[PDB]
Amino acid sequence: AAQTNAPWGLARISSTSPGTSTYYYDESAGQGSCVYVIDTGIEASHPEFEGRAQMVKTYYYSSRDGNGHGTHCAGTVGSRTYGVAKKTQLFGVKVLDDNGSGQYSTIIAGMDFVASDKNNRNCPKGVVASLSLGGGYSSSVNSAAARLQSSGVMVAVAAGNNNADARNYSPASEPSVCTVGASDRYDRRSSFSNYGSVLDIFGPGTSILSTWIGGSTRSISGTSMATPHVAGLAAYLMTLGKTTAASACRYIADTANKGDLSNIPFGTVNLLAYNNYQA
């Protein structure tokens, strides 16, 4: 399948080179997989989601996205125009208020919710979780993400936007999950992107076009934007049978574009997510 005039990041994940604008992918498109977006919520009624998104949990007075951040990440996972995995199922878990902030205990509860809730959903091709969030180091936040991974869910988390070593942030520093940094359309490390030995992969993160609340669209930047590219790619690859939840992060790094990014500090992997699709 070929989507012309696609956002640059979708084209990049199916290209050996930068600078193209067509996204190529297998038409299975993540059908039969599920991705939990743990964030500020999802505007499920956005036409771009085609009925495939729904909220399943909130810790606040409403389950609606009054911020836009969670709607934008879910659009990069699975919207018809802006998503990697265009037939996957999206489940929203609102752990952040409409200002984009949330207590760690609420975030830990949301991770534990997903590890049980997936036994209530139909996901024959596997389960992914996308955590575009984080803060200072916390062993209890890391152990929550480690439990969610252990339960059979591919966990992808943002490295953080501090231009620093991600060892000092959580859940970025949990070694058992997939920690994602950000790159731009010229194959440069995004200027805000964290780095370090804990990072596993890079995805597109600067000037990313996606769904927004009010039925709109907009382009924003962050390692929160690169995380759903990798989350969506794992759901895509799990539907094709190429990998499993326990091993997708390893598979994605094994099959990535190697040595293509500039300004990667010594000791950080030089690996950009790639779907290896041959049309």
Curated annotation (Swiss-Prot):
Q: Does the keyword Metal-binding apply?
A: yes
Traced from the root, the source organism's taxonomic lineage reads: Eukaryota, Fungi, Dikarya, Ascomycota, Pezizomycotina
Provide a GO CC annotation, any one. Answer: extracellular region
List of residues binding Ca(2+) 1: P175, V177, D200
User: Of which family is this protein a member?
Assistant: Belongs to the peptidase S8 family.
Q: Which GO terms describe its biological process?
A: proteolysis
* Disulfide-bonded cysteines: C34-C123, C178-C249
* GO MF annotations in UniProt: metal ion binding; serine-type endopeptidase activity
**The gene coding this protein:** PROK
Provide the protein name. Proteinase K
Where in the full protein does the shown chain start and end, and how long is the full protein?
106 to 384 of 384
Question: Mind listing the UniProt keywords for this protein, alphabetically?
Answer: Calcium, Disulfide bond, Hydrolase, Metal-binding, Protease, Serine protease, Signal, Zymogen
The chain positions of domain Peptidase S8 read: 7-279
Tell me the residue numbers annotated for binding Ca(2+) 2: T16, D260
Stated role:
Hydrolyzes keratin at aromatic and hydrophobic residues.
> Which sequence ranges form a coiled-coil region, renumbered to this chain?
none
Q: Which cofactor does it need?
A: Ca(2+)
Cofactor: binding details: Binds 2 calcium ions per subunit.
Q: Which reaction does it catalyse?
A: Hydrolysis of keratin, and of other proteins with subtilisin-like specificity. Hydrolyzes peptide amides
Tell me which EC number(s) this protein carries.
Answer: 3.4.21.64
| Active site: residue positions | D39 (charge relay system), H69 (charge relay system), S224 (charge relay system)
